[PDB]
Amino acid sequence: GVDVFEAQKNLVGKGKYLNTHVKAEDVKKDVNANIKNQFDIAKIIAELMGKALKEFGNQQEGQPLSFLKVMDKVKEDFEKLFNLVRPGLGKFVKDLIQSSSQAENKITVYKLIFDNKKTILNLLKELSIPELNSSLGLVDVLFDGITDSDGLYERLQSFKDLIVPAVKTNEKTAALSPLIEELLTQKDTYVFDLIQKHKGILTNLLKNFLADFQKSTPFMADQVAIFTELFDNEGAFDLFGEADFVDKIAELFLTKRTVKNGEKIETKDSLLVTSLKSLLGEKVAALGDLLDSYIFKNELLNRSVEVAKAEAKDTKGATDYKKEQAKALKKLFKHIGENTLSKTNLDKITLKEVKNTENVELEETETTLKVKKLDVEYKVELGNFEIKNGLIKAMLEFLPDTKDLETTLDKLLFKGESYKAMKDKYIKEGFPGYGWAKGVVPGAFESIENTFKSAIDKTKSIRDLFGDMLFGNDLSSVKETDSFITLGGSFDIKYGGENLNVLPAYYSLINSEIGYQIIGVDTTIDATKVKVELKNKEYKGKSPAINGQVKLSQSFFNVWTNMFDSITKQIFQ
Amino acid sequence: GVDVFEAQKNLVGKGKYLNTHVKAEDVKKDVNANIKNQFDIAKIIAELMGKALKEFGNQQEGQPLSFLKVMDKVKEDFEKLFNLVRPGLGKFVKDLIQSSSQAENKITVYKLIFDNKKTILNLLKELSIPELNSSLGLVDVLFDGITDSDGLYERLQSFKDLIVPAVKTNEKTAALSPLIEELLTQKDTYVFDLIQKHKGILTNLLKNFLADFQKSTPFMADQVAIFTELFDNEGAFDLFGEADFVDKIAELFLTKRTVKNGEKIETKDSLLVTSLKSLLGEKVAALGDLLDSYIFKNELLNRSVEVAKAEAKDTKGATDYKKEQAKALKKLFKHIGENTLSKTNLDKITLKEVKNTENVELEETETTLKVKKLDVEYKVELGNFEIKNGLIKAMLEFLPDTKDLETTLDKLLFKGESYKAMKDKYIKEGFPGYGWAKGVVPGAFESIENTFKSAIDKTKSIRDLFGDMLFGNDLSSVKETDSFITLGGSFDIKYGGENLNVLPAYYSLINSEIGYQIIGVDTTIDATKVKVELKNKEYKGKSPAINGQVKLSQSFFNVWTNMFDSITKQIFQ
């Protein structure tokens, strides 16, 4: 055949395939449907985590709820999602997430495969590896003369005597040999049961794929790093089985790791802490110690495995941080599910067409196909997307509630590396103009510290300080139903261009299904005309943590408000 | 004759004049008497200001007491002083200070001159000007055949017909012509009456002499500068007449000057302020503003002439600062007279001989005369020279008692030239490590100033602050009878040398009286073994001016104590 560019010699032209098979009305409708489907899949994704998250959060303590038992409660949504990402991929995913022991209605792997065979063929042809096509040449021969999944199972059992030696002899699939084994051994195979049962091999391939992606995608290196750290444990595949997702995600992502056997590497911390260390590498330094005392040393984010049964050995209520952290995660899931990403809250985000009338004329001249003038604009109206108090109040509750705020703030402000140097320099000499007054100095940098220390309320923790910084008013006096951040207005999408080339777009492997791509589309996301307003822009607190004549919680809140306005002016629109 | 060095050819030698007229016992006794007489004249000077100062201070308000009416009350002391500075100069000064209208027993100029004619001859021969000897050639002829002052007056009247044309024709004495005029016109001439009556001419010669001394003595330029500024006014000679010294010294030394007539130069300030400006030129800069608000702008040191009758025009009690300042000066004189430089307090300073036994052998060999081995040592035992509270408490009372201490200290500390620059720099950017927290800065350098300002007691003035800095305890609770500084121990004087040349020493002019001088005497003043102790080395105050958690009056007091110890370790012994 013709690889990628000898194809674009007999496929486009004056009256050749692409030009005569792509119409101006077709181009216009597909361009509009591109934005429409992107918005629709974004909305379905947002509601999906917000329909499953509500079930996660509302689950009672001590009652396990797996990652897949909740998948059924949103199964249709997945279908919708995946019937909008790719036409025809609606039954496959809805069947896939029902192919597990935790699903309400089990369906076998053979039922999963025979029904949506064409969709599986497209997905396999979309894989980046060429060699898979060698295994794809017998799929049509495999599915010939088959009317039900039972016949497919029988024919695969007949062909096993040739399939399994080829799999074993291939070094790439040599480790895979057990998998396909029971794919021909039991008629009641389930994809997710296999995934949770073949933990080691699947983790090995996942680690290799993630390492390859890291070597290929340095820009998202943090996400691949956290994924690899997650999948370094075989038990990380217990999510796709009979487990508790609201607990497994806590013991995988918010729990210290000891994945080694030499002497001890238990100091590996948690996944979230390592991700914060990577993402806050050197952006902030002085407050990093704060992160060391409140973010890197909290049992709700760093559960400190094997240390709970070290000094107590009696299981106190506070000692067991595996359920308090699970409760905090469940509360966060509750709020993100039914208060932020709910159907009602997501309903006030409307993608309205603006012009959608101009005809996208196509000009053909020899081996070319260009769009005369593409100009479509869609207004995404954010309505009033009330991010209520609780999306960030739950994250505040993740922070420890230890009342020891004086010592931590003293260490952060005064017992630092820069303030101490200035202290010493002013003690030995200094105070310009005065000079001879050196005994005054250890009476000057002592009340300067003393008033700051005495301002800090003895009964307020870092939760209260962060509530003053963000909410303004005190946490106990801040209503969870109020909106912390409200998104209003609308932002424009301005797909545009002149003389834009239209060229054939193929799948990853050899396939008879082809699309077309318009290259060089100026996709201007004019994010202006949106207002990300802090509803609590004034300090309403009555018992500030650092109140007094040296009120810093109010100053910190004003700093937060100003920095939020700056972020919404530069990072946003 | 032989000028200075051809004289030291026939005056010293083997058996020549100086060698055969100066004995080893004579050298020893004169060397011992040098230290003894220096100590004695120092003690008599100290008691003199301390016997006259007591009379100055104890004088009631509104009763004038001239500089010379008190001179009589100590007249004998002057004689003692001046009979120890130079033998025979005992009757002359005691007669001189009685030759005024303010003296209790008036004596004429002729009585002053004929009696101690020889002493006047020595003093005139001690004047630096050579030409005076031309007028000294007729003194012996003038005093021939005279038995009383009446005969001297008659002979000067006879010789006036030749004396006064010579005085008039001489340009140097041309301005002097009126003076000698009444020196032959009235038989009841008084030296100090003439001095106070011939103000202009005497001020002119004094100004010329002081300018010459300034051109000759740059090291004591400040003293000559204040003297010239003092004598720039003719009325400055009103001290030697019918006036009030405790008031005249206040209106000459602690009063603004307006000595000009062009438009106005009243901003010339006082003599003490100008002397402080010269002596505190650039040693202290930041606290100079303090001196601007409390030392340069106080009516007790800068009386602000012609401004009292400018805005009030009703003579309020506080407005008339000419008697409040006079009262403060009288209180200081009272304390220095009968508490610090009293006879009882000065009695505990003993000059004791240590060895005073070694013979000062003299070796003569050709034109030389050397001391074989001079070694005398005298111990000055300071006893307990209690400088009581009041030598410095009165000077504290000279400072204004305005309760406005907050504004002045705020200007000195915060509203300065260096703190404001740091303020601006930290406001625009800064706070290293933080960076993004710029709104916190106008909440940081606001309590830093606020606590310092709030510490300052509203009812305490600079007098109280200086009392805390120096005395420790509050001024109202500090007893004036207690000793601020006590001098104890003793210091040694170690006149020494080997092979020290002894050569003739002559007067300023041609004279028949000659002394001898030993050159190169190592006069080691070993000031060690003395203890200048602050009796109040601990803060006993109960109402400090800057009390609180930012106690600065206590810190200032500790700084003062440490700096006093440093001064007594380096400036002292």
Side-chain angles (χ1 to χ4, degrees), chain B residues 146-409:
Chain B
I146 281 170
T147 64
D148 36 32
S149 54
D150 297 0
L152 177 63
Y153 163 62
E154 293 302 319
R155 271 185 110 233
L156 301 153
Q157 282 204 159
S158 162
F159 258 122
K160 142 109 154 165
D161 287 335
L162 181 163
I163 285 170
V164 81
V167 166
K168 280 184 179 176
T169 43
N170 197 355
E171 286 192 346
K172 296 189 180 183
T173 69
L176 264 281
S177 165
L179 274 89
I180 318 85
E181 224 183 359
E182 330 86 338
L183 281 172
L184 297 325
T185 314
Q186 41 194 0
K187 207 184 172 281
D188 302 321
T189 317
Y190 304 109
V191 165
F192 281 125
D193 279 6
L194 251 52
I195 287 266
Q196 91 154 325
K197 142 178 140 199
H198 282 201
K199 278 190 291 317
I201 316 100
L202 269 298
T203 42
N204 284 329
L205 290 63
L206 204 42
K207 280 196 262 182
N208 300 343
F209 170 58
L210 282 171
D212 298 343
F213 205 71
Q214 195 171 355
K215 289 176 196 168
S216 84
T217 53
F219 58 100
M220 288 313 90
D222 174 44
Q223 284 85 357
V224 156
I226 178 175
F227 270 132
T228 36
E229 249 156 40
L230 158 76
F231 291 123
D232 270 344
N233 191 356
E234 295 192 358
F237 266 59
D238 208 5
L239 309 154
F240 307 177
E242 264 219 20
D244 205 24
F245 186 83
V246 86
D247 183 18
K248 209 53 95 183
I249 216 75
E251 163 285 355
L252 297 201
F253 277 93
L254 327 169
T255 284
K256 288 234 220 286
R257 296 169 282 128
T258 176
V259 193
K260 211 75 158 59
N261 60 287
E263 297 89 3
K264 196 139 292 303
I265 317 285
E266 204 261 330
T267 71
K268 213 157 207 216
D269 275 8
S270 87
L271 251 67
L272 200 133
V273 164
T274 43
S275 283
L276 266 39
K277 289 177 133 164
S278 152
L279 164 155
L280 304 211
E282 64 267 44
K283 179 191 134 204
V284 55
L287 280 90
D289 160 62
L290 208 63
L291 301 154
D292 170 51
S293 188
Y294 282 135
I295 277 275
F296 291 178
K297 187 194 320 162
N298 49 351
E299 311 300 277
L300 258 50
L301 288 199
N302 246 339
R303 218 198 49 232
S304 190
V305 47
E306 218 55 47
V307 180
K309 333 176 190 77
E311 59 202 343
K313 278 148 316 203
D314 39 57
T315 317
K316 306 301 199 43
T319 303
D320 214 41
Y321 284 104
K322 207 178 313 143
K323 283 165 320 173
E324 229 193 287
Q325 145 196 16
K327 191 191 305 305
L329 207 32
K330 248 177 265 197
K331 190 199 273 213
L332 175 66
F333 288 171
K334 267 192 190 79
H335 198 276
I336 307 183
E338 64 214 326
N339 282 92
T340 289
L341 287 172
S342 58
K343 186 44 91 184
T344 72
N345 216 49
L346 276 159
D347 260 338
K348 43 199 155 165
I349 297 189
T350 326
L351 176 87
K352 327 175 284 283
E353 85 291 332
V354 152
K355 182 77 157 58
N356 273 238
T357 322
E358 49 98 23
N359 191 17
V360 193
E361 188 152 15
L362 306 180
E363 326 158 31
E364 51 256 40
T365 166
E366 313 282 351
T367 297
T368 37
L369 177 55
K370 321 273 206 172
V371 153
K372 199 197 81 51
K373 183 76 178 100
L374 183 83
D375 173 46
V376 312
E377 153 193 342
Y378 281 83
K379 211 156 184 54
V380 192
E381 193 238 342
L382 294 105
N384 270 0
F385 192 78
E386 281 150 282
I387 298 173
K388 270 146 201 168
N389 297 332
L391 180 126
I392 77 152
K393 211 187 172 142
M395 321 175 154
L396 289 206
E397 293 198 6
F398 261 101
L399 264 59
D401 193 18
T402 56
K403 299 292 153 275
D404 218 341
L405 202 56
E406 266 214 78
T407 63
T408 303
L409 258 299

